[PDB]
Swiss-Prot record, chain B:
Record's protein name: Phosphoserine aminotransferase
Binding note for cofactor: Binds 1 pyridoxal phosphate per subunit.
Protein function: Catalyzes the reversible conversion of 3-phosphohydroxypyruvate to phosphoserine and of 3-hydroxy-2-oxo-4-phosphonooxybutanoate to phosphohydroxythreonine.
Gene coding for it: serC
Binding site for L-glutamate: R42
GO terms for biological process, alphabetical: L-serine biosynthetic process
Cofactor(s) needed by this chain: pyridoxal 5'-phosphate
Catalytic activity: O-phospho-L-serine + 2-oxoglutarate = 3-phosphooxypyruvate + L-glutamate; 4-(phosphooxy)-L-threonine + 2-oxoglutarate = (R)-3-hydroxy-2-oxo-4-phosphooxybutanoate + L-glutamate
PANTHER family noted in UniProt: PHOSPHOSERINE AMINOTRANSFERASE
Amino acid sequence: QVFNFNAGPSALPKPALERAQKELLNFNDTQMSVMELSHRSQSYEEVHEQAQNLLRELLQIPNDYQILFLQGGASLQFTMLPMNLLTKGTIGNYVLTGSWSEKALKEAKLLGETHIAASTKANSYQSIPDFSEFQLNENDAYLHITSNNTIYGTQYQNFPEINHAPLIADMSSDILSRPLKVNQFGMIYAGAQKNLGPSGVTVVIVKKDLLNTKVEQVPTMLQYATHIKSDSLYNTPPTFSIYMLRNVLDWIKDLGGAEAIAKQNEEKAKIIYDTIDESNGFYVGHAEKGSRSLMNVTFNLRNEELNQQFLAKAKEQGFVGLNGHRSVGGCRASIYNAVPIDACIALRELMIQFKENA
Amino acid sequence: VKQVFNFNAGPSALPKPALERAQKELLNFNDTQMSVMELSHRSQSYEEVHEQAQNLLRELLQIPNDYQILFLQGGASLQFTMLPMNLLTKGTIGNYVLTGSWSEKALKEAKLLGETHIAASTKANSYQSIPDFSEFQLNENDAYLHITSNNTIYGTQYQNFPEINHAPLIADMSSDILSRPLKVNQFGMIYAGAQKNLGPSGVTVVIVKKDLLNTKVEQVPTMLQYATHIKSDSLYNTPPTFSIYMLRNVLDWIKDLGGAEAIAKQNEEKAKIIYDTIDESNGFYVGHAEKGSRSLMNVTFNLRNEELNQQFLAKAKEQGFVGLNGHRSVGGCRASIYNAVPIDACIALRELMIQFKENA
Ligand SMILES: *Cc1c(COP(=O)(O)O)cnc(C)c1O
Ligand SMILES: *Cc1c(COP(=O)(O)O)cnc(C)c1O
Ligand SMILES: [Cl-]
Ligand SMILES: [Cl-]
């Protein structure tokens, strides 16, 4: 009777939460909660390391990348990245594919010279721009993309070959929804709360030799080098959030890893997109078909009265989270890894019944 | 199986009722059929928890209505830089009172951003005491005066606070916030990582006078402006929802036991058990702190030599004591006795200390 389509924080795998509940008072035979452990304890250090190792195995992260667990959300990364890499005489180059891309660019502008490599803003971010359109500069500090544009419902189907400067990706809303060639990136970051666990930890996967050096004048907490050198234990980490991340990663592994999860995600997205496409225009997706997200499906009915009726009916029927962001309007169905296919089927059935009764 | 005596210095022991409450409803919070961890931060169910945590803090510490309460990420360590970024301006001075390692860390971050000054320091005395307030060297263009209420590593604590009216008084209260009543109106801003006395790690509480920290900050990154978080009620970006939920649960527990005065009475009793054991030990245990600056939250002490220190800590670990190893700067032992550390663990520590001395 409850279908959780929340856009972040979001649904977690039942086994990960059940495991957490079962041992909440007695973690790993210590007779205390994981939340009561010192981050300097062997018990916690084992979890911290396992979470890293699971990420490394599941995404096939090369040995010369470091995995960091940071606080502050993806939003703090919007500023921390340019603080570390946008040096005088270089350019923070951005590909704009939605609202989250804009937020990232805005923070770089406060700190240095920026540039727009490509943008689909003028077309309401309905698509990912062709890579052949990208305007690249010899003095780029990096090229920043947003892999999944959570608000607009578009997603990179693949990633550009970028080697004049590091490619940086905000993968908050699609990290570990599919396999990745990590070597294509200088850095990947993601708040955990969309696809990896609860909120309060941000995963940063970074090429060590890019960022393992002290940057002059940058506050200690805001240097990647601080966290690299200290293995994300410079100050007190968000221990429960990291524990929950570990639990989620174990679930992904148990189901067969990134390939298996990608297959599930493709199947459940098809359920919703086919419903849109067969609706004779009653439901219209915001994204161009070739840029459709497998993680956030955005669509509208023919006018706002119909949008309101639909969302009111959905709320009455137990659906949570379906209201679209204002820039897109309509409905957003967030279908991250842990959202079950039966919830997607229920959404289809709701959509079909609503059209029939309109 | 070993008994548990949790003297961890941060993260730390939690109240059992708060954990039990969390466990019971972990899969279905407030009849939503979702964990609190699975809710939108813009849902009514989560907003109620967020607001309740603020209201409990406000009631328990008697925070005046013209103060705002923020829930931020990054730890107290991020506050070390965020504070001077927002208040340390050209032509002003970040003035610090140094009473331990945490004071030094705060000063260090301000130095990167502007002019700083040391109002007073007990560094030369190995941080064994809180300086006399008469020693404070103050400047007309201080942007603020910063203190560390409880010096977690050294085991000293402000017994009362200075009357400062020339500039804002700012305090890192990470390791003693809500261990006792507090006159909040004496401060412009108070911050604390939650993980010593308020909850689990992952959230930092900032109590700030509304009129104070959100001006002349155009050059400061969005996330690092207090103004951003003030305006959005700590929902600008996604908050650490489960940490704030757990904080709410801990605060309810404090309220249920009688509030700040009741917890201060418990804490004074706990500390007395340990300090009396040290003082009665004919030098077998020696406290780091001068008696008049002793912390009620972190009790620091050494045995006569490193071999005995090691043997004592090994015996402690065998008997189920967790977290007693001192920080390297004092060596020895540190018994952290935050709000939720039970008096019976202090009883157990005393018994261990008496037995170890008698068997040495
Ligand atoms: C939600 C989201 C963010 C912001 O994450 P916070 O952790 O709330 O700062 C950034 N980028 C994308 C793509 C998102 O979906
Ligand atoms: C632990 C502590 C800190 C550091 O807190 P983090 O949350 O680890 O950054 C700062 N000040 C005091 C007094 C502390 O005890
Ligand atoms: Cl977006
Ligand atoms: Cl200290």
